[PDB]
């Protein structure tokens, strides 16, 4: 009956003066915007059928054409952002946030789905969401003692749309949307479906995106718990955005990283900084390189439970980029650890992986682990051991790469460069 019209006979059925054949009509553009090749969405859009559509979604008389025209703006609004606007412009915001509230449990999840793909494209979009007050209907659909009576489709549905209402910056979304929110994400951090537990991880993961006001507003719901919990997950696409959550939070306060340390973050790290998967292993050496950046208690904490010999190893064999990380943990290390603390970074065995780097075609890698050298020799300085160490860097080729480091392109590598080889080599 409505599999593959045409645009110019939707066309003619929409502008019939005829309820049930425009009802045909918009169930046959919904089919048209849903075939997986390259749906018409700029045709429709051409053919004047958004206006159209969103009069639709008001005939409460008529809940079957309210269901099918939201499913074709939905299709419209999930594409490009020129294709959002044209929904959004069409005056979809207030007709969709009308249907929240539908007896019709098809028709308000569909509506959910529209408002998340519209305020997922943008800040803007989002404020605007936002504005037109479609939050507290949001949060009432989930407004029900226990969440496992709710449909699982239903609920990973409004998950999403409530992590969209919280995800893009320039700006961050507005301080008093984000409180209203915040107590619904923590519960549905707590819920047993793993693609709910997924979108609640990145919706939090948005939120701790920020400066330290915007990570305390989190971390005082006391989520810090729940996202070490999710961090040890099976699923991977629970433990990413648990892992970018952790990390960001850990670029706030030493008060805010201590809490991601008793909460025992750090035992996760072993098969972290291990982990197969690429990004997961470049994330945790991040995370552990904003750990070492903090105070010297927090430094002990990370050799206490075990991880030097961890950081040591993707120095040593890791993507590039990961590595880098890796570079930055161990600069920040030293620059802010104790002469103990440095002395059993060396023990280690951090030298010789530290040189290797030194063949990196990558200024800034190269003079970060200058900065890391530098920061070593200070603490050998204060124990009378320079020699040491430069026998040992002498040893592993360490000076060779110096050494070549002073006919280099930079100024600040050649500068440091030549500081060092005049200042510890002969
Ligand atoms: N003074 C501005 C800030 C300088 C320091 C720092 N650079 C951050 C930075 C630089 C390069 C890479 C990352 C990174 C990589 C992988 C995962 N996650 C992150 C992060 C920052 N916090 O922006
Ligand atoms: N005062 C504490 C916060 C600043 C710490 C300070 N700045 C550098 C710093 C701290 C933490 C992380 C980074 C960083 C940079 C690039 C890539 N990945 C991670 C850089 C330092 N040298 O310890």
């Excluded at 006979?9 to 919904?30: C, H, M, P, Y």
């Excluded at 507003?217 to 729940?226: A, D, L, R, S």
Aim: with cysteine; proline share 5%; glycine share 6%.
């Amino acid at each position: 009956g409505t599999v593959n019209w045409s645009v110019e006979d939707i066309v003619k059925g929409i502008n019939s003066n005829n309820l049930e054949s425009q009802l045909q009509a918009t169930q046959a553009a919904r089919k048209l915007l849903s075939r997986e090749k390259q749906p018409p969405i700029d045709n429709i859009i051409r053919a004047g059928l958004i206006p159209k559509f969103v009069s639709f979604l008001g005939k409460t008389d008529c809940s079957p054409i309210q269901f099918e025209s939201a499913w074709a703006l939905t299709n419209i609004a999930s594409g490009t952002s020129e294709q959002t606007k044209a929904v959004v412009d069409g005056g979809a915001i207030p007709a969709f946030i009308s249907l929240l509230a539908s007896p019709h449990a098809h028709i308000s999840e569909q509506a959910v789905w529209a408002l998340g793909n519209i305020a997922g494209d943008g800040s803007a979009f989002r404020d605007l969401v936002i504005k037109h007050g479609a939050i507290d209907p949001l949060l009432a659909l989930l407004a029900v003692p226990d969440l496992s009576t709710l449909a699982c489709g239903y609920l990973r549905n409004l998950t999403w749309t409530l992590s969209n209402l919280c995800r893009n910056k320039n700006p961050a979304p507005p301080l008093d949307a984000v409180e209203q929110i915040l107590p619904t994400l923590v519960r549905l951090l707590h819920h047993n479906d793993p693609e709910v537990l997924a979108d609640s991880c990145w919706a939090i993961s948005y939120l701790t995106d920020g400066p330290n006001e915007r990570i305390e507003m989190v971390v005082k719901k006391g989520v810090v718990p729940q996202l070490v919990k999710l961090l040890g997950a099976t699923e991977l696409p629970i433990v990413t955005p648990a892992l970018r959550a952790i990390g960001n939070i850990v670029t706030g306060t030493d008060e805010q990283t201590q809490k991601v340390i008793d909460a025992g973050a750090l035992a996760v790290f072993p098969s972290l900084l291990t982990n197969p998967k690429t990004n997961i292993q470049k994330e945790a050496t991040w995370t552990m390189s904003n750990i070492t950046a903090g105070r010297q208690d927090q430094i002990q904490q990370v050799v206490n439970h075990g991880l030097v010999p961890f950081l040591v190893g993707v120095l040593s064999k890791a993507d590039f980029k990961t590595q880098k990380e890796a570079a930055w943990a161990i600069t920040n290390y030293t620059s802010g650890g104790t002469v103990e603390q440095i002395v059993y970074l060396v023990h280690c065995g951090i030298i010789e992986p530290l040189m290797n780097l030194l063949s990196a075609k990558d200024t800034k890698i190269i003079q970060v682990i200058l900065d890391a050298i530098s920061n070593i020799f200070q603490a050998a300085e204060k124990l009378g051991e320079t020699e040491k160490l430069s026998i040992m860097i002498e040893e592993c080729g360490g000076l060779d790469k110096i050494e070549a480091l002073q006919r280099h392109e930079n100024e600040s590598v050649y500068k440091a460069s030549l500081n060092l080889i005049e200042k510890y080599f002969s």
